[PDB]
């Protein structure tokens, strides 16, 4: 009786109890820093909890601030949806312009028919595609976007009788091969998400966040250097990723070991079969003009990326230096070009060519508004503007200095102690909750952290940073584990057996490499910077 | 080139040949403004043809403005998504929980039950109602607010054959029918029109208000609250009267028997009786009021008076109280739409302890709206169509081409009194219908006191018609917010909205330009004469 009423009804319980709870840090202590101290453990208990969307709850700064001193209606609303949010929505509608006429199926056939046809080598191919495309999109979508595929060529496989898809007998038990696959998609989601800036929300972030509390900052985190940065990183755990699986459900070094003899079967008689699969299944037709236009938009977008800025020449940005353009101009002109174009140049007819027929109405043009209106997740406005409004306001009231010189204990460790300490608590905190909330939660502490002891802050944000999108143990960590326990029937304890490779393999891969590489792309992590000296002695 | 040709692809031709055809209007001139002006142009002519979809073409200024050099990326950006647009974007979420709990149908049918269940009596009395609300909110408030009760008496309508909604027929939503554009059209003007009731109607009277007062202390005639309302009440009555006529003979037949639209509605005249105990049949079915109706009536109505009274300028209000930082209308907006999620839908949970009686609910209860619901009904685009008015109007501030437009109008002291009035509330009704009324009122406002000043007439003589005709917008889906909003809502192209509108345009000029003159006089002893105080100030000139 009385047990389940908790069951059921914590949510609402949470909602109604927690801020009359929180009630007595405002009222005993008479600051504004306190007023600002209680609307973010509030917001801070609704993330985690996830008692309330989250779109929703980033919604509650534009009430609270005007309420409190903080700061006017007007500004909290400007603080929302600012240049980075815009050059984000605008790669969402590329990528939607991109999956729209079947760009993605059409790469991802022709690679995997490149690699090899025995199953490692499939498992491969399969892992490098998910990566390089959830560089450029979202990864809940290029799970959506690859699962089919896997899905057809084990369906193919058992109707002829290589391999069993499920155990023999309550949903069926998956067997090996398929929690090999599938999982192998789910975690190179996540692990090709950390690569780019546009890859993930999480980065958008931790990036929007570092710069606006530091707007004199020398070291920057512009779109060149960032991929930079990560990209080798990215594909050094990849890898170790792979060979993890291949050991655990394919035995990979045992050959006595049953599992490697199925993988033997399959090396006979198979890599036939899903070939022929592949090959019919390659029946999209020849490349049309749509999907030749969509590429170059997409090829131009990325060249003017790396041409905004660069050192060894001016290139634009410099020429037209009258104010900033700062590459929003580039993503929207793209967006807008996909609409100005036309998609078959079949009227051409018309103006003294012979051709065939001419057409009977309108051209289409590449994309419509209608497929944009409905496959955008437009709260994520909401989210990432509540978030930045939040450390905003963080750093006006005065919290911000109030906790540093709480926590200027910390200085007697060691450098390297504080970074692992870091990484482990950012990895055990999204193991249960959103990796946007978590980002948000954690950075502007760790910037005041950092300005408090001797410490750049860039050493400490970005690592953490990469290190929330690590999540493997849990169906409720990220969306895409969420989705392949969906389609697979994977168990939880499964999926937190096997997650032990990635978290390990992700944290070790992290701790060196932002040790000893990142001193190459950033030569000054080391030591403590002449504009953080004047921001602390400021602060 | 057959003719076909023509018939099919002329938009392609639009989108690439006017940007090279307007290009010699930057080449020949050598300032910012006038690539300003040129950008304007080419966003109007798009506008007009709706060769691109206007959502898009309204992103354009995010890529025009830095590379003509007129402001930064990050400022362009960021006037979008302004706090009034906050408002508005909040106003439609409150309105899809009024839709969700099915509140609107039961309103519809006590409206019904109140009028009588004809078309064109429930057409007048929703006009008048919509009227006399707006006189005190803001008119896209009341637009969103009426949008749903619109579309339940169109639906019970419907159901008893009198009419059809949508034309029968691949991404192209339905064509809306006559009488659907009638309505729609109908509460978009009434808002419009009833704005120029009072003061605190809209915020083009506060800003000429304020102009002229700061312009001209030591006036002898004074805009107060009694006195504006007594001076415009009687113009707005005619106005609205006028306005519907013209909307009844347009769309339906009203002095056309032959007319197949007259029919249909004689046809429903003769069925109303019988029409009469099917209604009440109906709304009996329904049973009493929910607890869900009942906290999202509750929350409607806190919302509504808590707009009323802020700042209302005849006592206190809440926004004087809580000074500290400036709270506009997005608080209790968005405090109305967090609150829906917060409660719950119904109180079974309470069973568990104390009520015996009472199942047990056996699972989480429902909140009042659920965020697929918002997500899949709210039109996203109008985001960027308003922003970029706003982004507009304020790049045409920083330019410089307001302050050319302003200089241009001084040419036309020459003309005689009545003549010069008549000008001027042309050329008002002209740029309000490219622009936001605001800034357009910015524009204008001040080069027609010192032109008064200068002609030796009274200000207010020129300043109140202007000031007015400010708000008199009709034409496209730019122009004001209520037509956006309702073109939105259900889908009605520029081309009919655009022929339809010449009706109040013409009714609202003629109206004013002989109100003004008959009526101010009686309001206003001395508009004819030149007073002394301006006699005054132009020697202080
Ligand atoms: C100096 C100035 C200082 C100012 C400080 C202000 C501090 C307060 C700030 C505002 C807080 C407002 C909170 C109001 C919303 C409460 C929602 C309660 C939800 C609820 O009843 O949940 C159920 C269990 O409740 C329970 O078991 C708990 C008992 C619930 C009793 C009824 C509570 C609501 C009564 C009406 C409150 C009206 C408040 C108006 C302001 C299970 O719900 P679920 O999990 O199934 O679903 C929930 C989602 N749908
Ligand atoms: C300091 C000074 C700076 C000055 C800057 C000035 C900038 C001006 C920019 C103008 C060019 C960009 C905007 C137009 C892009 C092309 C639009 C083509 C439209 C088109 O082909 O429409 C068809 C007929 O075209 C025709 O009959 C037209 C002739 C054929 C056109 C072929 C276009 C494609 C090849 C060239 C691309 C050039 C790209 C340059 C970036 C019929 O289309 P429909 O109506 O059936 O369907 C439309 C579905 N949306
Ligand atoms: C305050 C300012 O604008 N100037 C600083 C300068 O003092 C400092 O040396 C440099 C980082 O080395 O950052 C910049």
Same mark, same amino acid.
């Given at each position: 009786?009385?047990?389940?009423?908790?069951?059921?009804?914590?949510?609402?319980?949470?909602?109604?109890?927690?801020?009359?709870?929180?009630?007595?840090?405002?009222?005993?202590?008479?600051? *504004?820093?306190?007023?600002?101290?209680?609307?973010?453990?509030?917001?801070?208990?609704?993330?985690?909890?996830?008692?309330?969307?989250?779109?929703?709850?980033?919604?509650?700064?534009?009430?609270?601030?005007?309420?409190?001193?903080?700061?006017?209606?007007?500004?909290?609303?400007?603080?929302?949806?600012?240049?980075?949010?815009?050059?984000?929505?605008?790669?969402?509608?590329?990528?939607?312009?991109?999956?729209?006429?079947?760009?993605?199926?059409?790469?991802?056939?022709?690679?995997?028919?490149?690699?090899?046809?025995?199953?490692?080598?499939?498992?491969?191919?399969?892992?490098?595609?998910?990566?390089?495309?959830?560089?450029?999109?979202?990864?809940?979508?290029?799970?959506?976007?690859?699962?089919?595929?896997?899905?057809?060529?084990?369906?193919?496989?058992?109707?002829?009788?290589?391999?069993?898809?499920?155990?023999?007998?309550?949903?069926?038990?998956?067997?090996?091969?398929?929690?090999?696959?599938?999982?192998?998609?789910?975690?190179?989601?996540?692990?090709?998400?950390?690569?780019?800036?546009?890859?993930?929300?999480?980065?958008?972030?931790?990036?929007?966040?570092?710069?606006?509390?530091?707007?004199?900052?020398?070291?920057?985190?512009?779109?060149?250097?960032?991929?930079?940065?990560?990209?080798?990183?990215?594909?050094?755990?990849?890898?170790?990723?792979?060979?993890?699986?291949?050991?655990?459900?394919?035995?990979?070094?045992?050959?006595?070991?049953?599992? *490697?003899?199925?993988?033997?079967?399959?090396?006979?008689?198979?890599?036939?079969?899903?070939?022929?699969?592949?090959?019919?299944?390659?029946?999209?037709?020849?490349?049309?003009?749509?999907? $030749?236009?969509?590429?170059?938009?997409?090829?131009?977008?990325?060249?003017?990326?790396?041409?905004?800025?660069?050192?060894?020449?001016?290139?634009?940005?410099?020429?037209?230096?009258?104010?900033?353009?700062?590459?929003?101009?580039?993503?929207?002109?793209?967006?807008?070009?996909?609409?100005?174009?036309?998609?078959?140049?079949?009227?051409?007819?018309?103006?003294?060519?012979?051709?065939?027929?001419?057409?009977?109405?309108?051209?289409?043009?590449?994309?419509?508004?209608?497929?944009?209106?409905?496959?955008?997740?437009?709260?994520?406005?909401?989210?990432?503007?509540?978030?930045?409004?939040?450390?905003?306001?963080?750093?006006?009231?005065?919290?911000?200095?109030?906790?540093?010189?709480?926590?200027?204990?910390?200085?007697?460790?060691?450098?390297?102690?504080?970074?692992?300490?870091?990484?482990?608590? *950012?990895?055990?905190?999204?193991?249960?909750?959103?990796?946007?909330?978590?980002?948000?939660?954690?950075?502007?502490?760790?910037?005041?952290?950092?300005?408090?002891?001797?410490?750049?802050?860039?050493?400490?944000?970005?690592?953490?940073?990469?290190?929330?999108?690590?999540?493997?143990?849990?169906?409720?960590?990220?969306?895409?584990?969420?989705?392949?326990?969906?389609?697979?029937?994977?168990?939880?304890?499964?999926?937190?057996?096997?997650?032990?490779?990635?978290?390990?393999?992700?944290?070790?891969?992290?701790?060196?490499?932002?040790?000893?590489?990142?001193?190459?792309?950033?030569?000054?992590?080391?030591?403590?910077?002449?504009?953080?000296? $004047?921001?602390?002695?400021?602060?």
């Amino acid at each position: 009786k009385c047990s389940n009423f908790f069951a059921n009804h914590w949510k609402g319980l949470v909602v109604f109890l927690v801020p009359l709870l929180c009630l007595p840090v405002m009222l005993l202590n008479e600051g *504004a820093e306190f007023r600002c101290m209680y609307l973010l453990l509030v917001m801070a208990i609704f993330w985690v909890t996830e008692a309330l969307p989250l779109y929703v709850t980033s919604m509650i700064p534009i009430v609270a601030f005007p309420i409190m001193g903080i700061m006017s209606s007007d500004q909290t609303c400007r603080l929302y949806f600012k240049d980075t949010l815009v050059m984000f929505m605008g790669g969402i509608m590329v990528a939607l312009a991109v999956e729209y006429c079947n760009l993605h199926k059409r790469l991802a056939l022709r690679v995997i028919q490149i690699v090899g046809c025995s199953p490692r080598r499939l498992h491969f191919g399969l892992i490098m595609v998910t990566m390089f495309l959830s560089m450029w999109i979202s990864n809940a979508a290029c799970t959506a976007m690859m699962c089919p595929i896997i899905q057809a060529v084990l369906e193919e496989l058992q109707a002829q009788g290589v391999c069993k898809i499920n155990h023999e007998p309550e949903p069926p038990y998956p067997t090996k091969i398929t929690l090999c696959y599938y999982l192998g998609i789910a975690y190179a989601s996540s692990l090709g998400g950390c690569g780019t800036i546009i890859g993930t929300a999480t980065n958008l972030t931790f990036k929007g966040i570092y710069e606006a509390r530091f707007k004199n900052s020398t070291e920057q985190m512009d779109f060149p250097t960032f991929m930079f940065y990560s990209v080798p990183s990215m594909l050094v755990y990849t890898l170790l990723t792979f060979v993890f699986l291949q050991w655990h459900f394919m035995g990979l070094w045992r050959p006595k070991s049953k599992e *490697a003899q199925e993988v033997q079967r399959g090396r006979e008689g198979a890599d036939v079969a899903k070939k022929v699969i592949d090959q019919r299944y390659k029946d999209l037709g020849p490349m049309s003009i749509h999907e $030749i236009q969509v590429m170059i938009l997409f090829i131009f977008m990325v060249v003017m990326y790396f041409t905004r800025k660069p050192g060894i020449f001016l290139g634009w940005a410099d020429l037209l230096n009258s104010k900033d353009i700062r590459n929003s101009m580039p993503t929207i002109f793209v967006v807008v070009m996909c609409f100005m174009l036309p998609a078959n140049y079949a009227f051409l007819r018309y103006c003294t060519r012979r051709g065939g027929p001419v057409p009977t109405g309108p051209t289409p043009s590449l994309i419509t508004w209608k497929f944009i209106q409905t496959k955008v997740p437009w709260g994520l406005v909401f989210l990432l503007g509540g978030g930045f409004a939040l450390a905003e306001g963080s750093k006006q009231s005065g919290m911000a200095k109030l906790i540093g010189n709480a926590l200027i204990g910390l200085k007697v460790l060691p450098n390297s102690v504080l970074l692992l300490v870091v990484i482990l608590v *950012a990895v055990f905190l999204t193991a249960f909750s959103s990796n946007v909330a978590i980002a948000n939660i954690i950075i502007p502490v760790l910037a005041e952290m950092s300005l408090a002891i001797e410490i750049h802050p860039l050493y400490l944000i970005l690592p953490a940073g990469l290190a929330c999108s690590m999540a493997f143990h849990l169906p409720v960590s990220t969306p895409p584990n969420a989705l392949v326990a969906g389609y697979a029937n994977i168990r939880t304890k499964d999926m937190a057996i096997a997650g032990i490779g990635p978290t390990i393999i992700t944290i070790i891969t992290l701790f060196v490499f932002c040790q000893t590489w990142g001193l190459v792309v950033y030569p000054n992590l080391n030591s403590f910077p002449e504009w953080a000296q $004047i921001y602390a002695a400021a602060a």
